[PDB]
Amino acid sequence: KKSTNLVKNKCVNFNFNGLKGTGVLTESNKKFLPFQQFGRDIADTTDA
Amino acid sequence: ISVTTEILPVSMTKTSVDCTMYICGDSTECSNLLLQYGSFCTQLKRAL
Numbered sequence A: 001k002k003s004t005n006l007v008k009n010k011c012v013n014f015n016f017n018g019l020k021g022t023g024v025l026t027e028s029n030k031k032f033l034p035f036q037q038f039g040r041d042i043a044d045t046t047d048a
Numbered sequence B: 001i002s003v004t005t006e007i008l009p010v011s012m013t014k015t016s017v018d019c020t021m022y023i024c025g026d027s028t029e030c031s032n033l034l035l036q037y038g039s040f041c042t043q044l045k046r047a048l
Helices: B019-023 B028-034 B040-047
Strands: A012-016 A019-023
Touching (some): B019 B040
Antiparallel strands (some): A012 A019
């Protein structure tokens, strides 16, 4: 694969480690743990 | 001389739904596949 700079606050396509999606990315105030990679909402769709 | 209270509902909240966002979401291939089923969306929209 290749790599590309990170853009924020614009609706874009993203491919994070095989996770494909379309949306806008924003800085987060959430706190994770060293054994976690991403979070989920009620409908088991990624949010962070 | 007595005063009594009665309560009666009148109205109800109004909702609207989107087909493609709920069923497919952010994937175009699902939309192109769903275009070949029917016109259930028209019926749902008319009822709502």
